[PDB]
Symmetry: C4
Subunit: 206 residues, 4 copies
């Protein structure tokens, strides 16, 4: 379950060629146009993809995501912008990434997730916004980066997975960026909420 | 709920226009002149507002605060300056902020807070200083920023909340900086300490 | 609580004037020549002092300490340098400091400390080395500094406390650097180990 | 348990002389050519050595490792590259290293390690890759570095330990870089998995 070639050479260079990158952009960090919700290892997850269009070192790279909404407190205070962080692994250190080929960032929709109670229908009807961020510092250029994007509820594709971008050649790996934004539908995905899923699971565990 | 327009565009540009920022001199990181103490979601909180009025984003930003006072140890040792950390979310990572429009930083006055035993009258009589800090990197460079301010006990407004600065236009959001330092009164705010409120919550149950 | 003058002005200027700073140095971060062991609120602590003579603030400053020794594993492996981290607050974030006036860094000698079993007599006959480090970015240039020093066991003053350096004037605070390295002696300090202290406290209550 | 001389002088200078660094292909050489698996204090450990960069001395330094492989989820999804972080002390802060002389980084193969079930023969039949990373800031600058290397399963030497590189002289310590990549064999090393070593205690 590893390809023929090494992914990282002994000298630290990655053994990867990027193809179909398009026009050499000034910002080389990029997020997928859509986010997805799908099952992974028995858990309902929100995911989004991030990549570096070139072979630079993003040092001390890490990701965050926040749900953006207004809120009224119990005291009647109006909060125009409540920025609610969504768990992508801060507390265990797995928000920190080693970015070579595009990575799918994963938020598990568990009881602590803002999305725990949302079914496909709920999302279809909703108006919320998730901002996603990738920060680190590019080694060669000494530039601290904060790549930002946003998914509105209508840009999250319930029941989709990303197309593979990373392929093995005999001597190296290629990343096909023509597949970066591409997704496919998984009809087998539950349409109900993570909460419903956990209830249906307990009922069968007995 | 959400305004009509997106806050952050797909290309990462923040959909926000700043108004009433004033002269050149004022295009920096800034803290509100006052801090406030008020209830939020059934908890008494110390809050203060921070903003960025420059053209450049502050990357990997995070906040701290410390109460400054002298202290005598039980051994009789005089400590001229004790810098007692005030919890604004370090342990869960919520001290890390994504700073676009001005943010109200929140210290919950819980059992571990230096302010747990203090009522409005205690703050009135007190002379401590709370130093506030905002740090981060200048986007697209290797440079750093540290913004420092402080609030004397007499600059903390018990039973106040900040005026909103963030308003919805049809295609974008505006930040009105003329409201940044402004507050309103909440006469409803309890005048006792967070400890006392924690007790009045047993006398209920 | 507090002096007449604020310590930090609204504009972030610190209201401090430094006097008796040797003058014109290489290395403007400095550690006290000695470390001390003394009681602080019922607990035996190892302390050392750090100062900032820069023209600038030290941004994202934080401290560490390590005990340096060789050791042999149970398998017979010789480790020429085992670097044993000494707790100065990492786990709650209080290893992070806002360094204006000299700060006394405190290591509580508790059950998890390498020094838990060491009495004044033990230290008098010991040969270990404790390296102390202060890291951060110079505000003006983002230069990352790592200020390092070292205390051999014989450079630790059992039963000493630092002389105050920070004094109140009418409108400002003065930091007298002629007192930076100075200590005074506290004859009342127990001579036994932190573990002995914990046992006696236990015996007293039971 | 301490040499005659101090390792760090009062002024912060480290009392270490580096020798036999060579015209070495890279002055960028940071990681040992091989990783090892061996017992250390009754635990089976995966280890590898890292030195500081000769010409870019790194501070605020810290290490990471990941196991790289493909996997299929239970839903049938093919993941070309799963990057599973390997514990080297993040949670307690001991992933942060004060890197003067070459340090042997230690991943304890416990119940939570991806290697927990692998015996010497399992590693022989394996094709996985372990990426190792060192990051820090170049001392006295605002510049940053990420140094990488990699160990294929067949580059991990079961039952080996590194040769010492750090040596006491009278007034200082020398780091003999001629021994950096060298190992010795410990025939005494158990050949079973860390799971099996645990399930006999
Ligand atoms: K933690």
């Amino acid at each position: 379950s590893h390809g023929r070639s090494r992914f990282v050479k002994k000298d630290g260079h990655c053994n990867v060629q990027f193809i179909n990158v398009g026009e050499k952009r000034n910002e080389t960090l990029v997020f997928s146009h859509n986010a997805v919700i799908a099952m992974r290892d028995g858990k309902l997850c929100l995911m989004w993809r991030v990549g570096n269009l070139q072979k630079s070192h993003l040092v001390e790279a890490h990701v965050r995501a926040q749900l953006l909404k207004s809120r009224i407190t119990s005291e009647g205070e109006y909060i125009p912008l409540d920025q609610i962080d969504i768990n992508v692994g801060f507390d265990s250190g797995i928000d920190r990434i080693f970015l070579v080929s595009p990575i799918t960032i994963v938020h598990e929709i568990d009881e602590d997730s803002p999305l725990y109670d949302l079914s496909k229908q709920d999302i279809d009807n909703a108006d919320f916004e998730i901002v996603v961020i990738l920060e680190g510092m590019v080694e060669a250029t000494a530039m601290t980066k904060q790549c930002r994007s946003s998914y509105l509820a209508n840009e999250i594709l319930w029941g989709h997975r990303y197309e593979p971008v990373l392929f093995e050649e005999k001597h190296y790996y290629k990343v096909d960026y023509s597949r970066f934004h591409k997704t496919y539908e998984v009809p087998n995905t539950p349409l109900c909420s993570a909460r419903d899923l956990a209830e249906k699971k307990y009922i069968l565990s007995n």
